[PDB]
Amino acid sequence: AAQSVDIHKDQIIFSEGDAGDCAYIIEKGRVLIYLTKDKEEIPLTILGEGEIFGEMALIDNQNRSASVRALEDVRLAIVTKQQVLERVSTADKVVQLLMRVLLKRLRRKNI
Amino acid sequence: AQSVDIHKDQIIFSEGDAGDCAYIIEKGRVLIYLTKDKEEIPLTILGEGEIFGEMALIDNQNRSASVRALEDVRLAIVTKQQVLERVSTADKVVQLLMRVLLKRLRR
Numbered sequence: 001a002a003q004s005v006d007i008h009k010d011q012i013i014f015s016e017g018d019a020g021d022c023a024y025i026i027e028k029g030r031v032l033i034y035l036t037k038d039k040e041e042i043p044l045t046i047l048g049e050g051e052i053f054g055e056m057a058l059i060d061n062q063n064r065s066a067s068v069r070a071l072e073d074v075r076l077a078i079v080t081k082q083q084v085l086e087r088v089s090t091a092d093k094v095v096q097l098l099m100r101v102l103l104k105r106l107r108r109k110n111i
Numbered sequence: 112a113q114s115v116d117i118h119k120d121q122i123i124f125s126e127g128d129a130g131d132c133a134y135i136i137e138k139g140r141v142l143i144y145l146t147k148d149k150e151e152i153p154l155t156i157l158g159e160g161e162i163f164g165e166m167a168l169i170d171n172q173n174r175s176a177s178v179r180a181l182e183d184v185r186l187a188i189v190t191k192q193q194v195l196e197r198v199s200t201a202d203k204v205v206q207l208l209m210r211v212l213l214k215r216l217r218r
């Protein structure tokens with residue numbers, strides 16, 4: 001059950017401060033990552049097809065650091081913790097080992 | 112599968128060395144560290160079933176840190192060719208996660 005979701009142009013996918021449960025892979029369209037500071041919207045990046053966002057919510061299970069809006073009609077593949085564990089557990093030993101030390105390193109970094 | 116034993120306090124490799132393979136710790140523990148002006152700054156300690164020395168392989172440059180054995184250790188050698196082969200053949204979503212992790216670790 002790898003589910004997709006379609007998102008209309010100009011839809012806020014999520015907002016800075018929101019609860020974070022999953023990441024998203026862009027299957028079609030583009031998205032704006034941004035912050036809002038005193039009613040002024042400050043862009044950070046634009047992501048397109050085959051790129052992933054919201055991944056700190058996935059590994060660390062905490063709030064959204066930025067807002068994300070769709071610049072056009074987009075499709076998103078939802079990536080949930082259950083999928084990640086399932087895919088890492090079923091992976092090759094060396095790949096599993098790399099994923100572990102990467103995640104362990106990213107936790108020490110973000111301290 | 113070739114293994115290698117490393118004596119306690121042996122430098123496995125050093126920051127700045129050429130990087131040809133990674134290692135999975137089969138026995139013992141290892142210290143990952145940097146050296147700044149004869150002062151040694153620890154980063155992490157890894158133990159059994161953990162892997163190091165990947166970064167030279169996937170990013171294709173030198174060793175970013177030094178590694179020493181804290182006790183007698185045994186290491187399974189994983190050649191560069193194996194690591195690239197196994198990561199490239201891995202599942203699309205897993206590859207995508209590894210990329211953004213690495214991109215984050217660089218920033």
Ligand SMILES: Nc1ncnc2c1ncn2[C@@H]1O[C@@H]2COP(=O)(O)O[C@H]2[C@H]1O
Pocket residue numbers: 105130143154155162163164165166167168173174175176177178
């Ligand atoms: N915080 C870290 N900084 C640099 N290297 C690290 C760190 N944690 C683990 N390592 C590992 O130490 C290794 C040092 O040589 P590599 O560049 O080949 O790959 C590195 C990583 O696998």
